[PDB]
Amino acid sequence: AAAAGPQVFDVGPRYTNLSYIGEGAYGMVCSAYDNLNKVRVAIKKISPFEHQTYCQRTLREIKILLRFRHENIIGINDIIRAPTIEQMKDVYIVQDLMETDLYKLLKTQHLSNDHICYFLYQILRGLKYIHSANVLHRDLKPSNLLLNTTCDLKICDFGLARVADPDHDHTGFLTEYVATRWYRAPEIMLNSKGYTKSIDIWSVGCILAEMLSNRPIFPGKHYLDQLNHILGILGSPSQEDLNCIINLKARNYLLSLPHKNKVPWNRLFPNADSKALDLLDKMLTFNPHKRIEVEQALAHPYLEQYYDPSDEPIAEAPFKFDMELDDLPKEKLKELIFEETARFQP
Ligand SMILES: [Mg+2]
Structure with missing residues (x-):
């Protein structure tokens, strides 16, 4: 339900109080208050699923960032998406602000x-x-x-x-x-x-x-x-x-x-x-x-x-x-993205 210069930033009850930071490659970046950790975080909305190349970029990034753990490499704190592939249009990546x-x-x-x-x-x-x-x-x-x-x-x-x-x-x-x-x-x-x-x-x-x-x-x-x-x-x-x-x-x-x-x-x-x-x-x-x-x-x-x-x-x-x-189509990359982001579902 929160909107930032439309578009919809629906990052659930956990993140509120959004504020525009800038525009990423396949969506927008805002700061948000993390009601659980009680700090502001950065959230990037990614809507990549209409271009194979955007999907590739997104998959790489998620896979590598989830595997790496280093003080000088940004971490992914959370990923918010719909519970099913059918319903997933967007992915939100949460990082330290x-x-x-x-x-x-x-x-x-x-x-x-x-x-x-x-x-x-x-x-x-x-x-x-x-x-x-x-x-x-x-x-x-x-x-x-x-x-x-x-x-x-x-x-x-x-x-x-x-x-x-x-x-x-x-x-x-x-x-x-x-x-x-x-x-x-x-x-x-x-x-x-x-x-x-x-x-x-x-x-x-x-x-x-x-x-x-x-x-x-x-x-x-x-x-x-x-x-x-x-x-x-x-x-x-x-x-x-x-x-x-x-x-x-x-x-x-x-x-x-x-x-x-x-x-x-x-x-x-x-x-x-x-x-x-x-x-x-x-x-x-x-x-x-x-x-x-x-x-x-x-x-x-x-x-x-x-x-x-x-x-x-x-x-x-x-x-x-x-x-x-x-080698991989739009559609298969969406599937892998869904799987890669599963650990953040409750
Ligand atoms: Mg960049």
Whole structure:
């Protein structure tokens, strides 16, 4: 019966007192008072069942978030839906209420070096857990980093997440890609499907640069432009890095470009901590095989105040999908969604 700028937000007697926060991909996000726990929470209404791709996104997200348990990964506290498949039109995901996300925060606020260091550490701590589960997030960016008032950071939005599959990462030059353009590693445009852990480290490097200047570091206007921004700062790849690209069409594209020198990080980020820029460099390395891994990044000097591998937990087991969600109709995905959300029924 409660409505928020229609639409219906029917989250039962448990959640009342709704208030609009923003608009998600397949519905709206509000805060609400949790009459049981006596705190406000966030609730996301998802109406995905009219598009197969929305259903896939939703299923991934629910399955992974229910399995993961980590302080730097948003948890699902509750899921509200109708008692039967027939009656289920919407799903409501309840989470802890966060204050903001890093996208909204960087629109108006300069981060201190201590804030950048702490947020980086938390991103990487959460990512170490994700990667330890053999999962790739594949859409890390500021808006998918939730923040509370005490600067706790939680990674959210696993709708593009997949199990890592390095053996099957190769693709042709200029293969279409769905994840947010600005945070795409250079190999996506050249020879990669984004099925290795290195794709996520590049995104975190883009996020670090964006925390240092309050502006995206590689704001491509279109697919190939993205590559051209990246190369404009990193400069021409070395011969060894080109030789690592066997895809003739991709290698020849890079060979066709005029020589460009590297733009030094200290020029782009004159106010930055030197150790931050050294870690930035290692995350925004062109060759994905040479790019720093999450655990190495945590051990970097920049993060010395926080690094403690005994307090940077891993997952208890790898994550696997029963079935390939890519192949599955609108209707079967609705069925699995119903099953995945069953534990929250009374
Ligand atoms: Mg999102």
